[PDB]
Design a protein around this ligand. Sequence first.
Ligand code: FES
Ligand code: FES
Ligand SMILES: [Cl-]
Ligand SMILES: [Cl-]
Ligand SMILES: [Cl-]
Ligand SMILES: [Mg+2]
Ligand SMILES: [Mg+2]
Ligand SMILES: [Mg+2]
Length: 907
Amino acid sequence: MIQKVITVNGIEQNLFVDAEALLSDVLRQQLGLTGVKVGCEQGQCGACSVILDGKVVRACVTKMKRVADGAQITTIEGVGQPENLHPLQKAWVLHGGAQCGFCSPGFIVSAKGLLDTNADPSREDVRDWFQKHRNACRCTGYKPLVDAVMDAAAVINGKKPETDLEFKMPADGRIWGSKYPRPTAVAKVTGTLDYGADLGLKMPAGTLHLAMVQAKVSHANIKGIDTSEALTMPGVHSVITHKDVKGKNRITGLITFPTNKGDGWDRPILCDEKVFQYGDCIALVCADSEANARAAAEKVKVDLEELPAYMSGPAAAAEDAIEIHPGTPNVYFEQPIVKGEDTGPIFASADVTVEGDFYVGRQPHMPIEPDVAFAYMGDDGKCYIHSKSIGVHLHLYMIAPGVGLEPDQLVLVANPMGGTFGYKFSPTSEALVAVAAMATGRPVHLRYNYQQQQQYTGKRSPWEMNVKFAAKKDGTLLAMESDWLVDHGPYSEFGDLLTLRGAQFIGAGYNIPNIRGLGRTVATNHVWGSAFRGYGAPQSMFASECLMDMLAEKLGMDPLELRYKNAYRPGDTNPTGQEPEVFSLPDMIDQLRPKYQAALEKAQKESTATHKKGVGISIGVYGSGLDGPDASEAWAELNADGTITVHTAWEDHGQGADIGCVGTAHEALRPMGVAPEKIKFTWPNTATTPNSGPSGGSRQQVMTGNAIRVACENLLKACEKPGGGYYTYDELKAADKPTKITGNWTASGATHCDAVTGLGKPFVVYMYGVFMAEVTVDVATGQTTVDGMTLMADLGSLCNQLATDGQIYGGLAQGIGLALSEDFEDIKKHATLVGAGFPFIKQIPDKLDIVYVNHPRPDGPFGASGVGELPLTSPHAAIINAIKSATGVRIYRLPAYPEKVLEALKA
Ligand code: FES
Ligand code: FES
Ligand SMILES: [Cl-]
Ligand SMILES: [Cl-]
Ligand SMILES: [Cl-]
Ligand SMILES: [Mg+2]
Ligand SMILES: [Mg+2]
Ligand SMILES: [Mg+2]
């Protein structure tokens, strides 16, 4: 050990450290500076950026021996605090750069390092800086971050007053539709919002820290577990196995479809008889620290008989394949789509037909914050779980029978969280921590490292797809045929539903009177499927939107004009036979057309012999809601101090549940003139907030937005004075009148899609968009650079533009990753951010352009649709279409790795 006397955030610290210790650990654990965020732990994400003697360094890869006596360190806590914000922090808030907020301290610290060396950077300078310093963001698509740095620099340089970094009310006083900052922004930019791992460091002594004993093979029969060595290791309390589980030790898929051949109880909590995928948790070591628990977990011996594993859908779906879940066929669900007339004779007589085989793979969510959760036994006797769940009520029911608790005896709470992009539509660690808290009676905390985040949380499910179009010479679509195989890994939860998405979204956007198709779901031993933003659309629409360009090519028609010819218009129906609720695609195409023409001309003009430029188009469509008559609830409460709390379980992945609530409530409450700062939101809690539903299916703005609106309307009625005006809290209380008022809303016109035909009216609100990708392909290397993305977006009406701009930029960036670099195919190689193709800043163009063409929705609150998943529906199709435009080569199977593109170029 050594004494190190240094300065941290301007204060002399008399430090006692191990020379080998990581600066991140010292700062977080020894000094309580939890504003230093840790994600990847491998120097790849920059979340732990600190300034050390004028240089921006990643604290997770900086050992204390590299910290000189007398060194100066700055963390986010030293940059500024609430009530004392630095221009960079104010700018982040103004520009909405804090979505989940997990990368915000690291970006801001890094940015301060930049500005201290280059006071007046170009946008390009800012981008080069964040690239060099590995500052990664999964939420924002980077553009808002650069915006923020530029604005802060101008203030620091005296070129504009600091007061211009403060939001100015539109007054009208209307915050709906505005850039009003989100309530959580200040905490995020100051590092004072405690995420799951931060909470773990601030839990009491006697909290047990867990480590998972995980399967190191993909498929096995388990014979036994030997914990003897682990029990003797430092700090070890106990080891938990399936034997300690007090319930069924299974998670239920809960809404498993009746025609599913599986019962939906296939997923264990702790493996008992079988390993079903690499990473499966077989035991939990409870220890006094994460380090001690992990060390001991390595010594737990699992005796197993490895079995042949099926590592892809086609492999598992073979007629001969052995049942992974004995008693259930590997292909456990099929969804037909049967619209209009038989397609066979139509294809036979059509002027033109086209067909393609396409593949979209096992995209990893890659939030900067790896999975984390904790649990404890309350003094009330209930088991409390605090995690990254984005469906607290859903998860409660999915796990309660497995852990052996009645619904009333379990409470799930959503911690502030550093992104999920859908992986948290699934339980991950919740049942594990519950089991351990119940068994030990003590608080337990479980943090996954980045490898565990990659290998052992769910993934976008790969789809192998064949899609066909028949059309007239004039481009009119006559018929479509479709076949898709969904590789859902070993756990069935929502796999059937994902498969149904193919019936709803393959070929969405156009009038197609006649459809015959069949989706199939298959269990495999690759990673289990969890929702990934777009949930079936990124697969479905990659196929159909690529196929539309092939159709255009075959007709000798411009691909945008082919879409214009076919796009939804009054009278048309979508693939499930339902009338669209608005008709905005022709409008969007018409407004995009000149920008498209200009982009083509620029592409031709600026292409060289070695660097070929192209422009590609696609349409995206997706529902806002879960299928059928989805519903939400909110409570609007006048408090004693005149503030108003809007209680919901609107779960915040980081998308903006806070500002969604505040903005929607503010608009609903206008008659009573309620200032936005007086409106409070509630963190999701299954005991104390209503069942607003999960933040999945881009549904909360519509469902919970409506519920909030209704509740606020009902509060207004509760407060109304006879003769005009409104009663105060004290007045209502004096009259023994209610102050906490419920609102409910249901999408009553929606129906579930049929099990035989796929027909129905699954959502009452959809999101519609038109993408344009501009790319350059280096034909010597096969490397594609996305130089620009445009999204024409119909969101009905914007609750908040900082929120919606950010959502779209974030989705577009994930589109670039899905198109060019991302996958989780190799269990080891893809278990890091860099290995799995995470888009760093230079991979995302600065030119991300949005045009809102909003057609107010009959059923959305104040006309709003959702936005969440729209930007990831088909941007990767636009990009692939752009590569085709540039070079003449079509990539059918994502991602377009350079070697893959080169092989196609040279073929
Ligand atoms: S670079 Fe340190 S946590 Fe990712
Ligand atoms: S705001 Fe950057 S990772 Fe979420
Ligand atoms: Cl998906
Ligand atoms: Cl290909
Ligand atoms: Cl390659
Ligand atoms: Mg200042
Ligand atoms: Mg017609
Ligand atoms: Mg090769």
